[PDB]
Design a protein around this ligand. Structure first.
Ligand SMILES: [K+]
Ligand SMILES: [K+]
Ligand SMILES: [K+]
Ligand SMILES: [K+]
Ligand SMILES: [K+]
Ligand SMILES: [K+]
Ligand SMILES: [K+]
Ligand SMILES: [Mg+2]
Ligand SMILES: [Mg+2]
Ligand SMILES: [Mg+2]
Ligand SMILES: [Mg+2]
Ligand SMILES: [Mg+2]
Lengths: 130, 191, 177, 111, 205, 243
RNA sequence: AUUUUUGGUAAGCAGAACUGGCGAUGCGGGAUGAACCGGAAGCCGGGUUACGGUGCCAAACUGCGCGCUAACCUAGAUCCCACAAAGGGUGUUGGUCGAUUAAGACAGC
RNA sequence: GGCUUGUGGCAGCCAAGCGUUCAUAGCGACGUUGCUUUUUGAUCCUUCGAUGUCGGCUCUUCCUAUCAUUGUGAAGCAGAA
RNA sequence: CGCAUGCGCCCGCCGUCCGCUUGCCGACCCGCAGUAGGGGCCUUUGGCCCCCAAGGGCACGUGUCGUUGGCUAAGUCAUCG
C-alpha cells in the first residue's frame, strides 16, 4: 500500500497556483504541512503539500543539495523524458496543445476525425457481420 | 501531536493461513475458519513474507495519528492474536454454579447449543439461554456443578458465558448475602 | 516575498539635557507589521522599563532585519510571556521555518488557536536559532530524520483554478496514496 | 446522422438571468445580473466586456408577422469573482425573465 | 454558490454518499436559477454526527405539532426523498411564486426508478462525503434514519436496487465486449488512413 | 391553575373523527400475514346479522368457580350463505406500497353481482361486462386471458379473489344487489394462489372453508346510526347541576 | 446611552454631573426593536466606501492558510442582547516547577 | 402581565462534627455559590370614553422539583420493612 | 377494471389554422464499489502498467433551419411493419 511517499529526491507536480504544471524535487521537509522544493528554473523555497501531487519518479540525492548536483541527478534519472512519456505527464501537454489549436487546424482535425470515424464504423460493421 | 509513524508487528505461526484485503482479515487453521472486519479502523494492514525463510508477519501502522487513533493498533493486533489462538487451539470457558440452599438444575438441549435453568433460588420460572454460533456448552463430569463452553471465537464464547451469568441475577435481595448465580471461574484454551 | 511580521532594530535615547549631555542609548529587537508600530512598541517598552517617554525621548535609528539564508530550514525557539483570562504566564515554544518571520507568525497563530491570546497580549522575551540536537520539543525533533518518509494522508481535491470548476461531474473522484 | 431541424450555426453563448443588482433589502432593476455559460472567473469576463446581448421572448400578438420580441443589452462589468456579470438593457428586464436564457453574441469584436 | 450555469433540459443526480445539507444548498441554488433536477437514491444520503444525534433531532422535530389541531402541521415525512425535499424547501422562499416554481422543478426518488435507470447520473463534488467528511467521524445513512423513524420500504428498495444492479452489470459486460470489438476494428483500420492518423496523433491522450 | 381533582378524560381520541363512515360494508384494513408453507386458503368472509339468542353450556375451566358448572351466555347469529368467486386481483410490491396490477373476471356473472355496478339497474340497458364476456368465445380471447393470468403469477406479490354474496337467498332482506369484496388468498406460492383462484371461478365457497368451530375471529362493520347527539350521550360527560 | 455617582438586595426602580442621542429623523447594519454600530437626506446617471457581510434563504468565495473542539445534555455560532456561578473530569491540547532512569526508570512473571 | 427576588420555595460546594469505631450508608455546624416565579414584597411600563372583581362545580391540555405504578444502582440492605 | 349516448362520440392518415409550455438550437452519453484503494497484463510467493475528475468520449459537426437535377457499394440516423 501507499505506492507514493514524500521523500528527499521525490519529484512532485504543482497542482495549484501560478506554478501549476511544473515539476519540483522535494529536497527537505519543514513539517507535516510544507516541504522544501527545488528545480533547475526556480529558487529553492517552501510549498504546502496541498499544492503538490507526488509522481512515481524519484532521484538519488542528499538533502538540500547544490543546484549543479540536483541538475545532474535529474538528468541522470531522465526525469523530464520519463514524465513526458508517461500518460499522466502527456495529459497536460495534450491539454495545452488542444488549447493552442487555431481555427484552420481545428477544421483539419475535424476532417481527419470524421474520416477516421467513418472508416472505423465500416471496419466494425464488417467485424460484427463476420 | 500527530506522531508521524506508529507501527507494530506480530509473528504468524506457520500452521495458520491468513489473508488481508481492504482491512478484511481471514484466518485459517486446523480448527476452522474465522473472519473479522476491521474497516472501522483507519490503519494500513500489510502482510510481509520472507522469501528465504517463509515466515509471515502482520504489520499495522498509523500515519500522523493521534493518541486516540494510535491506541487501536495494539487492539487490532490483539484481535488478530485472539483469532489465531482460536483457530489453532480454541477457547474453553468454565462456569461454576453457586447456591446456598436450592441446587441449580441444568439441562443441556440437543446439540449442546442451549441450556435450561429451573431451580435458581427455588424459582418456578425456566431460564432459556441459546449458545452463539460456533459455541457449545456441556456439563462437566469430573467437576461438580461446572459448565464448559468451547468454541473458536473468543468473543462469542465469552458472550455466551456472560449471557448465562446475567440470566441468573438475584433481585430484591442483598446480593452480598445471596450469592447464588453462575459465574466464569476459568478462561483457557481447548488444546 | 512578503512577510506579515517584520523584525526591526529600534535605537533611541532620552532627550539630552544639562544634567545628561550624552544620555544612555537603548536598542531593542521588536516584531511588528510595520516600522511605525515597531516604533510605537519601542516607546511603550522604553516608557515602561526605563522611564523614558516618547514626548521627552529621541528616535535615532530603525532598520529591518532579514533572514540571512531564507533558502534553508532552521529550528527557532521563542521565549514569550502572555496574559490569560486569569493572569500572566511564561512560555517557550519551538518552530521550524525558513525564516524567523515565519516562525513568529506561526507563534502568533498557535497562541491564538491554543490559548485564545490576542496579538497585543503577547510579549516576546527572546528569539534564537536552535541546533537540531538542542531542540526540546518532540514536534520539531520528529522531522530531524536523515531519511524522512511518509505518505500524503490528507490531500484536498480541486481543479488547478476556478476556470475548470464544474458543479456536476460524471464520475466520483479517484483518490489513492 | 442527427436529422435535426434548427439553426445551422450558433455564433452566441447562453446567459441565465439571475436577477437584479441588489442588497439584502433593496433592489435596483436598472442593472441585471447575468451568468454566462462557460465563464467561471472575473478574469474570463474581460473577453465579454462590452459584448452585445439579446433577450428574446414570445408575445401573444404578432409584430411584423412574428410573435418574437427582443430587448437588446450588453455586458457592462464583472460581478463578484465567479464569472457573473452586470448587464444593462435598453429597458429594465421584466422580473418574469428570471431563469430565462439570453443570447450573448461575439460582437462588437476586438479580435 | 453562483450556480452551475449549464444549459440542459434536466440533470439527474446520484445522491449516494452526499452530505444532505450541502447537496440541498447546491440544488436549491440550481433550482432557483431555473434548472430542473432529478435526484435518485435519496436513501443513500449521508448525514454527519451519527445515527444517534440525527435520530434525537428527528424526534425533537416530531415533538412539534399544533396543540389544538395536529392535522394543521408541521407534517413529519419519514421517507428519505421527502426528507430531502423538505430540507431543500427550507433553503428556498417557498411561500413566493418564485420559490414555488423553483420547487416544482425538482423531483426526488428512492432508488433508481425508470426511466432514470438508463440515464447518465452525475455527482456533486462539493457535497461528496469523501471530500467533506474526514474518515473516522460519525455519519449515518438517510435510509437507515428513515427506517428507524418509521419508513417501511427499505427492504423493497434494497431488493429492487439489487435487481437493477445485476441488470446494469450485464449491460456493462455487453458494453465492454463491444468496446473490445471496436478497438479491434480501429486496429484493423489503422493501416487504411496514414495522414489522418498523423494529424490526430499530437492530440490523442 | 391546576384542576382541583383528577379523573380520566371522557372518551377515546383514537376513534377520531366521530364522523359518518365513508362506507356501508365493513372494510378489511389488514389481512393476516401470509405463510407460504401452508395450503392456499381464504382469509375473510361476508355475513349478515340475523339476531341474538342465549345458550347454556357446561364450562370446562380448571381453577375457575364455573368449572363443571352451567353458564348462560348471549350469542349472535350471522347468516353466511356460500360466496361466489368471480375474479382474481394481483398486487405488485413497490416502494410506494401495493399497486393493483390487473383484474381478471369470470366469463359468467350473475345478475345479483352485476346489480352492484348500477344505480338504477332496471332503467339501464344492462351492458356491464357484455364485451368482456366475449373474450371467452374466441381463441385469441382465451389466450389473452391465460396470458393475463400468467403475468399475474409472474409479477404479483399478494393475490386476492373477488367474491360476492348470494343476497337474494335471504328474502328477509329486501335487496337484490349483492355485496362484492376482495378476499386475500394466503398460503402457497403466487402461482399456486393464482391457480387456486382461477379454479374457483363461478363456484361457491362455503363459510366452513374459511372458519371453523371454536375459532377466534374478528368482526368488521358499521355501528348503528344515531344521528346528531349531544356531548352527554356522545362522549359520556357528566350532567351539570339542576339549576 | 459611555464614563462619574446617591438610596435600594435588586428592578425595563428612584435621583443627580459632563457630553451625545431619541423626542422632532428618514436611510444601511444588529433577523425583529425610539435610543446600539454606520451615517444624517433636494430629483437622477456612473464610480467607491462606512458598519456589516460573502453554504442556501440573500448581493458577495463551499476562496487561500494554521491549530483547537466531537458534545450518547438540543455541541457551538458575534457590543447593547435578550443570563449562568462555586466546585469538579485519568476527555483532549499546549506550558511551569519537581522526582527516577543503560553502575538498567514503572507493571507482571 | 412585564423587570427584580429582599422574603418564600428548591438545589449545590468545603468538611468541624453526628452516626457502638467511621467526615461523606444516612446527615452537614461555622461559611459560601446558585436556581425558580405556584409566596409575599418592591416598582408603576400597559389598561380608568371599563380586559366582569373570591371560592366552588364542569372540561381539556401542559410541566417535573416522581406520591403510586415499570426497570435499575447504594445502605449502619439476613428476611420483611 | 366495467360501461360509455344514432343530426353524437372515439381512433388512424393527409392539408390548413389557433392556443399552452417549467424558458429548444448537438437541447448526444445507464457499470458497481472504494477512497488507509480500485483495475489490466503477465502468473515466482512475484514483476510491469493505468488512475491523479465528463479537464473524457460520440456525432457531416462543413449547406441561406440549409439552391437546381442524376447515380448511390458499404456505414450511420430517422420513419413504417
Ligand atoms: K383550576
Ligand atoms: K353530574
Ligand atoms: K430568591
Ligand atoms: K400597575
Ligand atoms: K381602568
Ligand atoms: K367543593
Ligand atoms: K450535413
Ligand atoms: Mg393534578
Ligand atoms: Mg455612532
Ligand atoms: Mg449611486
Ligand atoms: Mg464509615
Ligand atoms: Mg426528573
Amino acid at each position: 500500500p501507499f505506492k507514493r511517499f514524500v521523500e528527499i529526491g521525490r519529484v512532485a507536480l504543482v497542482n495549484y497556483g501560478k506554478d501549476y504544471g511544473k515539476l519540483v524535487v522535494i529536497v527537505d521537509v519543514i513539517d507535516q504541512n510544507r516541504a522544501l522544493i527545488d528545480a533547475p528554473d526556480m529558487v529553492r523555497s517552501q510549498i504546502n503539500f496541498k499544492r503538490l501531487s507526488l509522481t512515481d519518479i524519484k532521484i538519488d540525492i542528499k538533502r538540500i543539495p547544490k543546484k549543479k548536483t540536483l541538475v545532474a541527478a535529474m538528468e541522470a534519472a531522465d526525469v523530464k523524458n520519463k514524465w513526458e512519456s508517461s500518460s499522466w505527464g502527456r495529459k497536460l501537454i495534450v491539454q495545452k496543445r488542444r488549447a493552442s489549436l487555431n481555427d484552420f487546424d481545428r477544421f483539419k482535425l475535424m476532417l481527419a476525425k470524421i474520416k477516421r470515424a467513418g472508416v472505423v464504423r465500416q471496419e466494425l460493421a464488417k467485424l460484427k457481420k463476420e | 501531536m500527530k506522531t508521524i509513524l506508529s507501527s507494530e508487528t506480530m509473528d504468524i505461526p506457520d500452521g495458520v493461513n491468513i489473508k488481508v484485503k481492504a482491512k478484511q482479515i481471514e484466518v485459517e487453521g486446523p480448527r476452522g475458519k474465522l473472519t473479522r472486519n476491521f474497516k472501522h479502523l483507519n490503519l494500513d494492514f500489510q502482510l510481509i513474507k520472507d522469501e528465504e525463510t517463509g515466515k509471515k508477519k502482520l504489520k499495522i501502522d498509523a500515519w500522523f495519528g493521534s493518541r486516540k487513533t494510535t491506541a487501536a493498533i495494539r487492539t487490532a493486533l490483539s484481535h488478530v492474536e485472539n483469532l489465531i489462538t482460536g483457530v489453532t487451539k480454541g477457547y474453553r470457558y468454565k462456569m461454576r454454579f453457586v447456591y446456598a440452599h436450592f441446587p441449580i438444575n441444568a439441562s443441556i438441549s440437543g446439540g449442546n447449543k442451549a441450556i435450561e435453568i429451573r431451580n435458581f433460588l427455588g424459582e418456578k420460572r425456566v431460564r432459556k439461554v441459546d449458545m452463539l454460533e460456533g459455541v457449545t456448552v456441556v456439563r462437566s463430569e469430573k467437576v461438580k456443578d461446572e459448565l464448559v463452553l468451547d468454541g473458536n471465537d473468543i468473543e462469542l464464547v465469552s458472550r455466551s458465558a456472560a449471557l448465562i451469568n446475567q440470566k441468573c441475577h438475584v433481585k430484591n435481595k442483598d446480593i452480598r448475602k445471596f450469592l447464588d448465580g453462575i459465574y466464569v471461574s476459568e478462561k483457557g484454551r481447548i488444546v | 516575498v512578503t512577510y506579515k511580521f517584520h523584525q526591526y532594530q529600534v535605537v533611541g535615547r532620552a532627550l539630552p539635557t544639562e544634567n545628561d549631555e550624552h544620555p544612555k542609548i537603548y536598542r531593542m529587537k521588536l516584531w511588528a507589521t510595520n516600522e511605525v508600530r515597531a516604533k510605537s512598541k519601542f516607546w511603550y517598552y522604553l516608557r515602561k522599563l526605563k522611564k523614558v517617554k516618547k514626548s521627552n525621548g529621541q528616535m535615532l535609528a530603525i532598520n529591518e532585519i532579514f533572514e540571512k539564508n531564507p533558502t534553508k530550514i532552521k529550528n527557532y525557539g521563542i521565549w514569550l510571556r502572555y496574559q490569560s483570562r486569569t493572569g500572566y504566564h511564561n512560555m517557550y515554544k519551538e518552530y521550524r521555518d525558513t525564516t524567523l518571520n515565519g516562525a513568529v507568525e506561526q507563534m502568533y497563530t498557535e497562541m491564538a488557536s491554543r490559548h485564545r491570546v490576542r496579538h497585543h497580549c503577547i510579549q516576546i522575551i527572546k528569539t534564537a536559532t536552535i541546533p537540531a540536537k538542542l531542540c526540546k520539543r518532540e514536534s520539531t525533533k520528529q522531522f530531524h530524520d536523515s531519511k524522512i518518509k511518509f505518505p500524503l494522508v490528507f490531500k484536498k481535491v480541486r481543479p488547478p483554478s476556478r476556470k475548470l470548476k464544474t458543479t456536476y461531474k460524471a464520475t466520483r473522484p479517484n483518490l489513492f496514496m | 446522422v442527427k436529422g435535426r431541424q434548427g439553426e445551422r450555426v450558433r455564433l452566441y453563448v447562453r446567459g441565465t438571468v439571475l436577477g437584479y443588482k441588489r442588497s439584502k433589502s433593496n433592489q435596483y432593476p436598472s442593472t441585471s445580473l447575468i451568468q454566462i455559460e462557460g465563464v467561471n472567473t472575473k478574469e474570463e469576463v474581460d473577453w465579454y466586456l462590452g459584448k452585445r446581448m439579446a433577450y428574446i421572448y414570445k408575445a401573444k400578438t404578432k409584430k411584423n408577422n412574428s410573435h418574437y420580441r427582443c430587448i437588446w443589452g450588453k455586458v457592462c462589468r464583472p460581478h463578484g469573482n465567479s464569472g457573473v456579470v452586470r448587464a444593462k438593457f435598453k429597458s429594465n428586464l421584466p422580473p418574469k425573465s428570471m431563469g430565462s436564457k439570453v443570447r450573448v453574441f461575439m460582437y462588437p469584436s476586438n479580435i | 454558490v453562483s450556480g452551475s450555469g449549464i444549459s440542459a433540459r434536466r440533470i439527474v443526480v446520484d445522491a449516494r454518499h452526499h452530505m444532505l445539507g450541502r447537496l440541498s444548498s447546491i440544488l436549491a441554488k440550481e433550482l432557483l436559477n431555473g434548472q430542473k433536477v432529478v435526484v435518485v437514491r435519496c436513501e443513500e444520503i449521508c448525514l454527519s454526527g451519527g445515527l444517534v444525534r440525527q435520530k434525537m433531532k428527528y424526534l425533537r422535530f416530531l415533538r412539534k405539532r399544533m396543540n389544538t389541531k395536529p392535522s394543521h402541521g408541521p407534517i413529519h415525512f419519514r421517507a428519505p426523498s421527502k426528507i430531502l425535499w423538505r430540507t431543500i424547501r427550507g433553503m428556498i422562499p417557498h411561500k413566493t411564486k418564485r420559490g414555488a416554481a423553483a420547487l416544482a422543478r425538482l423531483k426526488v426518488y428512492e432508488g433508481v426508478p425508470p426511466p432514470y435507470d438508463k440515464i447518465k447520473r452525475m455527482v456533486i463534488p462539493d457535497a461528496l462525503k469523501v471530500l467533506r467528511l474526514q474518515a473516522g467521524h460519525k455519519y449515518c445513512l438517510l435510509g437507515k434514519l428513515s427506517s428507524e423513524v418509521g419508513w417501511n420500504h427499505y427492504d423493497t428498495i434494497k431488493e429492487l436496487e439489487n435487481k437493477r444492479k445485476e441488470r446494469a452489470q450485464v449491460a456493462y459486460e455487453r458494453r465492454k465486449q463491444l468496446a473490445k470489438l471496436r478497438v479491434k476494428a480501429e486496429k484493423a483500420a489503422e493501416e487504411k488512413l496514414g495522414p489522418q492518423l498523423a494529424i490526430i496523433a499530437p492530440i490523442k491522450y | 391553575s391546576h384542576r382541583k381533582f383528577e379523573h380520566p378524560r371522557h372518551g377515546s381520541l383514537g376513534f377520531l373523527p366521530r364522523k359518518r363512515a365513508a362506507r356501508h360494508r365493513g372494510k378489511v384494513k389488514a389481512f393476516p400475514k401470509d405463510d407460504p408453507s401452508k395450503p392456499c386458503k381464504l382469509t375473510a368472509f361476508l355475513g349478515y346479522k340475523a339476531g341474538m339468542t342465549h345458550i347454556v353450556r357446561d364450562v370446562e375451566k380448571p381453577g375457575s368457580k364455573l368449572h363443571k358448572k352451567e353458564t348462560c351466555e348471549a350469542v349472535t347469529i350471522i347468516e353466511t350463505p356460500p360466496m361466489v368467486i368471480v375474479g382474481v386481483v394481483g398486487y405488485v410490491k413497490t416502494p410506494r406500497g401495493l399497486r393493483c396490477l390487473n383484474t381478471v373476471w369470470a366469463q359468467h356473472l350473475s345478475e345479483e353481482l352485476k346489480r352492484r355496478f348500477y344505480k338504477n339497474w332496471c332503467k339501464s340497458k344492462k351492458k356491464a361486462f357484455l364485451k368482456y364476456s366475449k373474450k371467452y368465445e374466441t381463441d385469441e380471447g382465451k389466450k389473452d386471458i391465460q396470458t393475463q393470468l400468467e403475468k399475474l403469477k409472474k409479477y404479483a406479490c399478494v393475490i386476492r379473489v373477488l367474491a360476492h354474496t348470494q343476497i337474494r337467498k335471504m328474502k328477509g332482506l329486501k335487496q337484490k344487489k349483492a355485496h362484492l369484496m376482495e378476499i386475500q388468498v394466503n398460503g402457497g406460492t403466487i402461482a399456486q394462489k393464482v391457480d387456486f383462484a382461477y379454479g374457483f371461478f363461478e363456484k361457491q365457497v362455503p363459510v366452513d372453508a374459511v372458519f371453523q368451530k371454536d375459532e377466534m375471529i374478528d368482526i368488521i362493520g358499521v355501528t348503528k346510526g344515531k344521528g346528531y347527539e349531544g356531548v352527554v350521550t356522545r362522549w359520556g360527560v357528566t350532567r351539570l347541576p339542576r339549576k
